[PDB]
C-alpha cells in the first residue's frame, strides 16, 4: 500500500490522513492554530513521526491514531486511517 495506514494504535502509523473520524481537518502538529498546543508537535514528540498535520498516535492511544482538529468545538479527535498491520 502507499503506507497511509496504521500499525495497531498508529504509533508507527506513517500515513497521510489529515482528517478526524468526522472528516474535520487535522491541525498542524506544528501549528498552534487555531488550537494552541505546545504538545504533540514534531518537536515535542520526535519519536512518533509527526509531520505537518498527517494523523499520528504520539501517545499510542489504544483506540487508534488521532490529531488536533481545526474544529472550534474540540481540541483533538481521532482519525480514520485503515489498519496497515492487518
Curated annotation (Swiss-Prot):
Name of protein: Plasmin heavy chain A, short form
SS bond list: 5-84, 26-67, 55-79
Domain spans labelled Kringle: 5-84
Top-level taxon of origin: Eukaryota
Natural source organism: Homo sapiens
Top-level taxonomy: Eukaryota, Metazoa, Chordata, Craniata, Vertebrata
Coiled-coil segments on the chain, per record: none
Amino acid at each position: 500500500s502507499n503506507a497511509d495506514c496504521m500499525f495497531g494504535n498508529g504509533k508507527g502509523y506513517r500515513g497521510k490522513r489529515v482528517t478526524t473520524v468526522t472528516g474535520t481537518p487535522c491541525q498542524d502538529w506544528a501549528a498552534q492554530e487555531p488550537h494552541r498546543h505546545s504538545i504533540f508537535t514534531p518537536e515535542t514528540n520526535p519519536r512518533a513521526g509527526l509531520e505537518k498535520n498527517y494523523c499520528r498516535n504520539p501517545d499510542g492511544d489504544v483506540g487508534g491514531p488521532w490529531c488536533y482538529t481545526t474544529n472550534p468545538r474540540k481540541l483533538y479527535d481521532y482519525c480514520d486511517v485503515p489498519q496497515c498491520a492487518a
